[model samples]
Target: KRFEVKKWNAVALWAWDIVVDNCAICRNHIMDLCIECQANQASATSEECTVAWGVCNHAFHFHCISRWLKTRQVCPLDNREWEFQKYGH
Candidate 1:
């Protein structure tokens, strides 16, 4: 026989929301350090190599996107407009 249930235990799952493939500017995987980081410092340990997501949910390496931001300030991929909506670690 089983007794009445009072407490329960279970696990849950979550997502980063979604998965990003590659960065258009660097042509490298968005999750890894971009080319700029690698070339700038062969053995650097900086955490600047993060990904940036535009307002439209497009993903690109922050380092690469930053260069263009200094110029156009728009999502170069879609070429629609300028602005950032989200940023994740």
Candidate 2:
């Protein structure tokens, strides 16, 4: 029985109660590289693709958001003026 329980534990699946899972702009998983970051991998660091949260509480890659702000200047998810709330991994 102990061996069975250990096997079950080994195969068990766990899910994180994450609030956001993807970047709206790049449609890439939040934990993965954005489109541009992936394309620029030769020159980009993990820091360049760090997450940035907008005042609207939406999250996106810093590179993605900065490029987006150059033209749109608004949260792609909420259409609100894009303002940085915080930045992080």
Candidate 3:
């Protein structure tokens, strides 16, 4: 897998601020990666990825993980299987 490094600017930082403040995780921060589909592009109101607690604590875009889960159910970081239901449980 190829890893693309994304930079966080003032705009991104500010956005993250709003996200983390409203999000469940207080440690919310933008990640730099190229794991297939980027989760940072997801919106807090609409689409959202599963909250990965380990390594890449980055929330994945639902579409990205849904497609990825078709073949792999574990997190790319530690290979721990991800679980999904209606609302995040």
lDDT of each: 0.66, 0.66, 0.41
lDDT of 2 by residue, 1-89 (tens): 55553344346643232235666777777757778766645766644667776557666777777888776785655567877778875
User: What's each prediction's clash count?
Assistant: 0, 0, 1
TM-score of 3: 0.32
Clashing pairs in 2: none
Q: What is candidate 1's CA lDDT for residue 84?
A: 74
Worst lDDT 10-window in candidate 1: 13-22
Error of 1 at 78 (Å): 1.7
Candidate 3 residue spans exceeding 4 A from truth: 1-58, 85-89
> Mind giving the per-residue lDDT tens digits that candidate 3 earns over 50-78?
43332234344344455666776666544
Q: Candidate 1 deviates by what RMSD?
A: 5.2
Q: Comparing candidate 2 with candidate 3, which one achieves the higher TM-score?
A: 2
Error of 3 at 79 (Å): 2.1
Q: In model 1, which residue pairs have backbone atoms overlapping below 3 Å?
A: none
CA RMSD for every model? Answer: 5.2, 6.8, 16.2
Candidate 1 local accuracy as lDDT?
0.66
Q: Tens digits of per-residue lDDT for model 1 on 1-89?
A: 48787887988854332244655777766677777776546566766567776656677777777877776865655566846766754
Best by lDDT: 2
Q: Rank by lDDT, descending?
A: 2, 1, 3
Per-prediction TM-score to the true structure, in the order listed:
0.60, 0.63, 0.32
